[PDB]
Amino acid sequence: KVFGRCELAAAMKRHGLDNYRGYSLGNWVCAAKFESNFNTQATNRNTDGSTDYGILQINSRWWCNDGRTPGSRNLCNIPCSALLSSDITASVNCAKKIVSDGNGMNAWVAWRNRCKGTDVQAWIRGCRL
Ligand code: NA
Numbered sequence: 001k002v003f004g005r006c007e008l009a010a011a012m013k014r015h016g017l018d019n020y021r022g023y024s025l026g027n028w029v030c031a032a033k034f035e036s037n038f039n040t041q042a043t044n045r046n047t048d049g050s051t052d053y054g055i056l057q058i059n060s061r062w063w064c065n066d067g068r069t070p071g072s073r074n075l076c077n078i079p080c081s082a083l084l085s086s087d088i089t090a091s092v093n094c095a096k097k098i099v100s101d102g103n104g105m106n107a108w109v110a111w112r113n114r115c116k117g118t119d120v121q122a123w124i125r126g127c128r129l
Pocket of ligand 1: 060061062063064069072073
């Protein structure tokens with residue numbers, strides 16, 4: 001499923017991401033736009049043999065099991081295919097674990113390089129929230 005901007009803002013708010021760990025909804029919407037172009041089915045192979053999955057491009061090196069990332073962890077306790085669902089629940093639950101420790105939203109390269117420090121509130125402009 002390819003979400004619209006305001007459609008994804010509404011889904012992320014319902015699933016409890018607005019101000020999760022102090023990150024406003026616009027940060028999450030911006031991160032999804034530049035990680036996946038709002039596409040739940042997005043996948044990208046990494047140099048280390050891991051793969052990034054779904055609307056927030058969550059990696060199999062740490063977060064999910066895809067059966068082809070030897071020596072990796074599964075800290076979200078899910079198959080990576082769960083991150084490609086039209087339903088964003090599994091991606092949101094896993095994103096909440098990722099953001100809660102380590103480097104916060106810096107874990108998302110597209111967020112750090114394309115959203116951090118910008119007017120991220122613009123990403124929710126015009127949305128019925
Ligand atoms: Na893994």
